[PDB]
Design a protein around this ligand. Structure first.
Ligand SMILES: COC(=O)CN(C)C(=O)Cc1c(Cl)cccc1Cl
Lengths: 300, 237
């Protein structure tokens, strides 16, 4: 079990740790988060009580270093930092635990939610979407735009998701205009899977990462990416059987985890009705279709 | 974006553009089978691609063989349309390619956009105008040529004949739409009006009779009365 200690909590903030969150009052004696499960990526995220503008946060993997949060009064945000001195770090974490100034990552043992949402997500790939290689963790926030959004402005702070565009020369083979536009199998399997992502896991990992950025930061371009990657699969007549089954699990846990009240803004009505009811894969997402119809039948 | 009443004059500026109408691409007769079921028999169609400024009608004849062995023909027709318009643009020299293509039905937007990805600088636009281009098969001649075709074939007509020698493209387009609206609302009457007078003939290279300016005014007035006539017959007004 790993720890993300905090130097302090100088400003009132809602702190998020994966799908959990808690309130920290201005200058409350808070020194971080303990018992974080090794083996998964994690995201620690923040919404200031005084300005819920800018949710922001850090994707990280405790196996990649010792990380702590420290408020920066100049830049005005909780910053993740790496401590290279491993002994200093252990000493700090031990003191804070002894004084019990840490909240415990509150994982229910029966609960595989976080694993199921991050199954295919790898820090290595996160660090390619979020380019800031001097750090081993990755900063995301609400307002970061995607490479594709900048096409239609600061490239250093972009989300470098894989550009999917159904009406693009990449998506459409000359001579198969109708075929490729109505059955996107070539684009999914040949261009994206074999060509860009190399395998389904890397595809699913970006899809999951897009969803999580959409959910935790209300990052709109992430939501566009999540929906595009779903639609590309659902609009392919030919998808490996294991990918469909896994897709259905992936989306099931994403829909299960989405706040009931945030559905209106994170769920694209057109994409979901198309995917569940019109697309080639309309009959292949049984779990997802069942949770969607019972939880968000309005949208449908 | 969309083409409507507000920007109606853009059609006649000097930016090359084409209207594309696909309403006569896929045409069928519906008949009873010996078993008493219903079947369709395709008949030749055409893509109506019109430069509203110059009067050029690039009339691509869609021979029924294009449908042979194909499923979902109403949907294929939009993609065939797109494929042919794209081929027409590619065949055209750069300085002749349209800057915009306006499709009369929105269902053509995605097919043509996809077929024209090689031409990102050609704007594909819908229109809110109800244009009567479906009646193009009522222009006597046009019905005759698309129905005699035995193979795919592109035919050129000036749909304005030599009118632009005497009127602007705005006025020519308005004459054309009024003629087509009339033919669409009551084809028998419309043709009666156009041909009542045997002394006025249709030139070999023309679609319409050689009316004098004064005779066009009379003709145009009679076509309005017809459209107004059918309007009352339809609505009992
Ligand atoms: C080379 O391919 C072409 O289609 C050349 N072209 C644009 C025309 O023939 C235009 C035209 C038409 Cl369609 C009808 C009457 C007169 C004229 Cl000029």
């Amino acid at each position: 079990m790993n720890t993300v200690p905090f130097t302090s909590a100088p400003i009132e903030v809602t702190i998020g740790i994966d799908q959990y969150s808690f309130n920290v009052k201005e200058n409350q004696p808070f020194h971080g988060i303990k018992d974080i499960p090794i083996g998964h990526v994690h995201v620690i995220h923040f919404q200031h009580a005084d300005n819920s503008s800018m949710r922001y946060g850090y994707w990280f993997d405790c196996r990649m270093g010792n990380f702590y949060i420290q408020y920066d009064p100049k830049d005005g945000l909780y910053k993740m930092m790496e401590e290279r001195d491993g002994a200093k770090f252990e000493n700090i974490v031990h003191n804070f635990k002894e004084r019990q100034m840490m909240v415990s990552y509150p994982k229910i043992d029966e609960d595989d939610t976080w694993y199921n949402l991050t199954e295919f997500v790898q820090m290595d790939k996160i660090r390619k979407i979020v380019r800031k290689d001097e750090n081993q963790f990755s900063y995301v926030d609400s307002s970061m735009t995607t490479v594709q959004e900048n096409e239609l402005s600061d490239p250093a702070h972009s989300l470098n998701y894989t550009v999917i565009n159904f009406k693009s020369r990449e998506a459409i083979r000359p001579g198969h205009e109708m075929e490729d536009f109505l059955d996107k199998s070539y684009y999914l399997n040949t261009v994206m899977l074999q060509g860009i992502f190399k395998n389904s896991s890397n595809y699913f990992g970006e899809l999951q990462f897009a969803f999580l950025n959409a959910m935790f930061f209300g990052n709109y371009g992430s939501s566009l990416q999540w929906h595009a990657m779903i639609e590309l699969i659902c609009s392919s007549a030919t998808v490996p059987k294991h990918m469909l089954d896994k897709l259905d699990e992936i989306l099931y846990y994403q829909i299960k985890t989405l706040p009931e009240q945030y559905s209106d803004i994170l769920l694209n009505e057109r994409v979901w009705n198309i995917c569940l009811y019109s697309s080639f894969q309309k009959n292949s997402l049984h779990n997802t279709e069942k949770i969607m119809e019972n939880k968000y039948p309005e949208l449908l | 974006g969309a083409m409507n009443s507000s920007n109606y004059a853009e059609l006649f500026n000097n930016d090359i553009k084409l209207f594309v109408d696909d309403t006569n691409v896929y045409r069928v007769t519906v008949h009873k089978t010996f078993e008493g079921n219903v079947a369709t028999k395709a008949i030749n169609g055409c893509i109506f691609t019109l430069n509203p400024k110059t009067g050029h009608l690039f009339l691509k004849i869609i021979h029924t063989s294009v449908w042979a062995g194909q499923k979902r023909l109403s949907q294929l027709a939009k993609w065939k349309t797109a494929e042919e318009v794209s081929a027409l643009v590619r065949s055209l020299p750069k300085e002749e390619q349209p800057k915009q293509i306006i499709v009369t039905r929105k269902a053509m937007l995605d097919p043509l956009e996809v077929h024209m990805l090689d031409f990102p600088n050609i704007a594909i636009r819908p229109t809110e105008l109800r244009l009567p281009f479906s009646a193009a098969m009522s222009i006597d001649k046009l019905s005759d040529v698309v129905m005699k075709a035995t193979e795919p074939q592109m035919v050129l007509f000036n749909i304005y004949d030599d009118w632009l020698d005497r009127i602007s493209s705005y006025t020519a387009f308005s004459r054309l739409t009024l003629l087509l609206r009339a033919l669409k609302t009551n084809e028998e009457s419309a043709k009666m009006i156009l041909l009542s007078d045997p002394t006025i003939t249709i030139k070999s290279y023309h679609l319409w009779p050689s009316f004098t300016d004064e005779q066009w005014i009379t003709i145009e007035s009679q076509m309005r009365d017809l459209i107004l006539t059918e309007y009352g017959r339809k609505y009992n007004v």
